[PDB]
Design an enzyme around this catalytic site. Structure first.
Site, short mmCIF file in Angstrom:
data_model
loop_
_atom_site.label_atom_id
_atom_site.label_comp_id
_atom_site.label_asym_id
_atom_site.label_seq_id
_atom_site.Cartn_x
_atom_site.Cartn_y
_atom_site.Cartn_z
N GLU A 35 0.82 -1.20 0.00
CA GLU A 35 0.00 0.00 0.00
C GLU A 35 0.85 1.25 0.00
OE1 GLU A 35 -3.11 0.39 -0.45
OE2 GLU A 35 -3.90 -1.62 -0.19
N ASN A 46 -7.97 9.15 -5.18
CA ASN A 46 -8.80 8.20 -5.93
C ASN A 46 -9.64 8.93 -6.98
OD1 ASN A 46 -7.97 6.05 -4.23
ND2 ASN A 46 -9.37 6.82 -2.68
N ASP A 48 -12.79 9.05 -7.52
CA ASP A 48 -13.98 9.73 -7.03
C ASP A 48 -13.67 11.00 -6.23
OD1 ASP A 48 -12.97 8.65 -4.66
OD2 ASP A 48 -14.75 7.55 -4.10
N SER A 50 -11.88 11.12 -3.32
CA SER A 50 -11.37 10.77 -2.01
C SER A 50 -9.86 10.52 -2.08
CB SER A 50 -12.04 9.53 -1.48
OG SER A 50 -11.78 8.42 -2.35
N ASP A 52 -6.46 8.38 -0.13
CA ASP A 52 -5.94 7.35 0.79
C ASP A 52 -4.74 7.90 1.56
OD1 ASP A 52 -7.76 5.59 -0.41
OD2 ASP A 52 -6.28 4.66 -1.66
N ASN A 59 -8.91 5.28 3.51
CA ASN A 59 -9.61 6.11 2.53
C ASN A 59 -10.53 7.10 3.21
OD1 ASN A 59 -11.18 6.98 0.35
ND2 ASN A 59 -11.70 4.94 -0.36
#
Ligand SMILES: [Cl-]
Ligand SMILES: [Cl-]
Ligand SMILES: [Cl-]
Ligand SMILES: [Cl-]
Ligand SMILES: [Cl-]
Ligand code: NA
Length: 129
Positions: A35, A46, A48, A50, A52, A59
């Site tokens: 990750e 991301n 959309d 959002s 991380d 998230n």
């Protein structure tokens, strides 16, 4: 802070992640590696809108507040910036909530695609634990 593999393993074990919900420690270290490359300051946006955050790439759509993901929740009740700290306490406590929510570690796409079904104990081999 960029953790070493065994340094992170020891931190995770002290904070109660070894066999948490049945996931042995090497699962958590494997997920952190893919990750964030063990970097507590990692961020990734991301599609959309959002973001991380942190060593386990938690998230903002569901788990923390960053002030720029409209419509989202803050289920770990923390500012996302807390997840970037060199102290992994907030990340671990929030991860324990995520893995408890029914989907297990499948919540981490890198775990599903790169750790699941592999020899995860390899990630803690050689560590003094
Ligand atoms: Cl393991
Ligand atoms: Cl890679
Ligand atoms: Cl927001
Ligand atoms: Cl599970
Ligand atoms: Cl891989
Ligand atoms: Na949020």
């Amino acid at each position: 802070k960029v953790f070493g593999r065994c340094e992170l393993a020891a931190a995770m074990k002290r904070h109660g992640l070894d066999n948490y919900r049945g996931y042995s420690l090497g699962n958590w270290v494997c997920a952190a590696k893919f990750e964030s490359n063990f970097n507590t300051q990692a961020t990734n946006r991301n599609t959309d809108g959002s973001t991380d955050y942190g060593i386990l790439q938690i998230n903002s759509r569901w788990w923390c507040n960053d002030g720029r993901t409209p419509g989202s929740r803050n289920l770990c009740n923390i500012p996302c910036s807390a997840l970037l700290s060199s102290d992994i306490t907030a990340s671990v406590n929030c991860a324990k909530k995520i893995v408890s929510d029914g989907n297990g570690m499948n919540a981490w796409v890198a775990w599903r695609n790169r750790c699941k079904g592999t020899d995860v104990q390899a990630w803690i081999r050689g560590c003094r634990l």
